[PDB]
Design a protein around this ligand. Structure first.
Ligand SMILES: [Cl-]
Length: 468
């Protein structure tokens, strides 16, 4: 009998799993919300703000109304190269959030030392991709890398139709702190990463006023062979593609239909992505330069990285947020930690989600969220930034690992406003002027220089309907 080759496997379940890390795809978690798990690992934070900063040049008339298509193409070309490096070195891309790619090597505590070596090599090879790189004006197609190691907590929250996950804890805080110290082309190690690493592998430089360190070179001992070392490390990598499947970038490329698993996984993916996955919408429909309102919600906790107390509080906040956004087809695009606060990136006006009077609705939704979350047990401070304008939306990443992402000056502005004007609902001039709500519902704010934004325009506090 003939032996014809297996079909290229591109079942819906495989297409869904492209949008999710192995942490979720193979997690088999309890249905309970919140769900908390605890493990150890090495985190890599790749700052791709240098790539995402391209949204401005692609809004130019030079791109002839194909700005979004051109942007997604060049962003994915460069980001795919980073993704392939992380996956080949055995990492799990957790999230494309906060103009960064966050990757995880989950390993038993005893193996952290050897895995840091693998992750440092990976980090240097990432930098090596962009060594002879430019874009005919600026050479700043480069990245910054922060690494951390240690205890990691995972939170899964949501309801019966939607699920979100977050990683929590000191190593999560550390990796963001480490990447923030990095200059372009740097690999910075968190204090605990430096303490846990194989110091015989690396030459470091002190970081002024910091216990974090900078990797100058990976200079291994004489009898060292990275390939044999890597092979030894794969013993501890549960999902590294191997044997029959060593030619695939992810084990998840081999996932077979399984309705109970697909029911679980689809809850992490928004419905317009699932429409595309089901071949019920054109594959290019979600790549667009679209006017939206960003409502960026930051929740601060006293117990800044203790999953047992912050997990219920986030789930409580989520249940209210989701109820508020449902009314106006608002979506939660991303949730992630920033300086130990939990941030919800909410978007009004996604494709096919429109709704007229988007601005006044966005403000009223923000105030509703503000008032409710301020009374949630263990939430110390709520801050909300509201900014409106043209943003890039689209699926960013590699074919085998990508996520729907919103990028733009107005996303960064709403994020910076919630940090620089804590404890209040703030909005930009577009939102203030467009809302047509009476002027005394707002307070014109002092101008703050916010790192990443120049120049914000007049900013306002949404005070609300009454003097209160
Ligand atoms: Cl996360």
């Amino acid at each position: 009998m003939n032996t014809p080759k297996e079909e290229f496997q591109d079942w819906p379940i495989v297409r869904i799993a492209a949008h999710l890390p192995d942490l979720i795809v193979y997690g088999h978690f309890s249905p309970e919300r919140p769900f908390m798990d605890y493990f150890d690992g090495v985190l890599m934070f790749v700052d791709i703000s240098g790539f995402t900063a391209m949204t401005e040049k692609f809004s130019s008339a030079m791109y002839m109304d194909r700005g979004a298509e051109q942007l997604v193409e060049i962003l994915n070309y460069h980001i795919s190269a980073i993704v392939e490096k992380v996956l080949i070195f055995g990492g799990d891309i957790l999230k494309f959030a906060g103009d960064a790619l966050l990757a995880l090597w989950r390993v038993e505590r005893k193996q952290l030392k050897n895995i840091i070596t693998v992750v440092i090599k990976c980090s240097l090879e990432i930098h090596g991709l962009f060594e002879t790189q430019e874009w005919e004006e600026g050479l700043d197609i480069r990245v910054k890398i922060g690494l951390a190691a240690g205890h990691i907590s995972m939170l899964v929250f949501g309801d019966e139709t939607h699920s979100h996950f977050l990683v929590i804890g000191q190593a999560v805080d550390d990796v963001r702190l480490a990447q923030n110290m990095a200059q372009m082309n740097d690999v910075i190690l968190s204090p605990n990463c430096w303490q846990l690493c194989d110091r015989s592998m690396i030459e470091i430089e002190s970081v002024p006023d910091q216990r974090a360190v900078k990797v100058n070179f990976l200079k291994p001992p004489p009898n060292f062979n990275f390939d044999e070392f890597f092979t030894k490390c794969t013993t501890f990598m549960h999902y590294y593609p191997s044997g029959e499947h060593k030619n695939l970038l992810r084990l998840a490329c081999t996932l077979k239909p399984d309705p109970e698993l697909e029911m679980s996984l689809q809850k992490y993916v928004m419905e317009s992505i699932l429409k595309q996955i089901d071949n019920k919408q054109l594959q290019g429909y979600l790549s667009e330069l679209r006017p939206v309102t960003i409502v960026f919600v930051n929740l601060m906790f006293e117990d800044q990285d203790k999953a047992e107390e912050i997990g219920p509080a986030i789930q409580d906040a989520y249940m209210h947020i989701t109820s508020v956004l449902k009314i106006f087809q608002g979506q939660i695009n991303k949730v992630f930690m920033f300086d130990k606060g939990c941030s919800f990136l909410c978007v009004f006006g996604f494709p096919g989600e429109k709704v007229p009077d988007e601005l006044t609705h966005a403000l009223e939704c923000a105030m509703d969220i503000f008032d409710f979350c301020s009374q949630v047990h263990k939430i110390q401070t709520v801050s909300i930034g509201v900014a409106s304008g043209i943003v890039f939306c689209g699926i960013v990443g590699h074919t085998v690992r990508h996520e729907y992402t919103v990028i733009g000056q107005k996303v960064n502005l709403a994020a910076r406003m919630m940090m620089y004007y804590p404890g209040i609902v703030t909005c930009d001039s577009v939102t203030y002027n467009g809302s047509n709500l009476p002027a005394y519902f707002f307070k014109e704010l002092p101008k703050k220089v916010m790192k990443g934004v120049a120049d914000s325009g007049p900013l306002y506090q949404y005070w609300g309907r009454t003097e209160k």
